[PDB]
């Protein structure tokens, strides 16, 4: 069974939209969601489908780069770091169920590395 998917939306949580938040989802997000690495990344861990049902024994917060663009496509964060919260908690998940040189590791690596890439210059 997989557990329901991390809210896109909360109408008691305060919206916001920043030039940050916006550089976000047009350039850092849609970015790298072409890279060829993204697609295990592009919705939350079908645990299900890919047979792996002590997933979700193991990672109590899942996120992933479908449940991101949703939100900043809501308006959901209120500031950038949020965003960029949710993005390391994604790469960390996988670090975590996964071991060094696993190919979905490598996968989740490279998208971490061009992720800080892009991140490492917001607009003001
Ligand atoms: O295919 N996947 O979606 C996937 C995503 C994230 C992970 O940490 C995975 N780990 C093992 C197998 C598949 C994974």
Same mark, same amino acid.
């Given at each position: ?6 809210? /896109?939306?909360? $109408?008691?949580? $305060? @919206?916001?939209? /920043?030039? %940050? *938040? !916006? ?6 997000? @849609? /970015?790298? =969601? @072409?890279? !060829?690495?993204? =697609?295990?990344? %592009? %919705? ?13 024994? &193991?990672?109590? +917060?899942?996120?992933?780069?479908? +449940? ?12 950038? !770091?949020?965003? &960029? %919260?949710? #993005?390391? +908690?994604? #790469? ?6 996964? @071991?060094?040189?696993?190919? &979905?590791? *490598? ?7 061009? #992720?800080?890439?892009? &991140?490492?210059?917001? $607009? +003001?």
């Amino acid at each position: 069974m997989n557990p329901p998917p991390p809210e /896109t939306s909360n $109408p008691n949580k $305060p @919206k916001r939209q /920043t030039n %940050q *938040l !916006q550089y976000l989802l047009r350039v850092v997000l @849609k /970015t790298l =969601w @072409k890279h !060829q690495f993204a =697609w295990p990344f %592009q %919705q939350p861990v079908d645990a299900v489908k890919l047979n792996l049902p002590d997933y979700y024994k &193991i990672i109590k +917060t899942p996120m992933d780069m479908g +449940t991101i663009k949703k939100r900043l496509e809501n308006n959901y964060y209120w500031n950038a !770091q949020e965003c &960029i %919260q949710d #993005f390391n +908690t994604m #790469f960390t998940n996988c670090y975590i169920y996964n @071991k060094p040189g696993d190919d &979905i590791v *490598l996968m989740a690596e490279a998208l971490e590395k061009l #992720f800080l890439q892009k &991140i490492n210059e917001l $607009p +003001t």
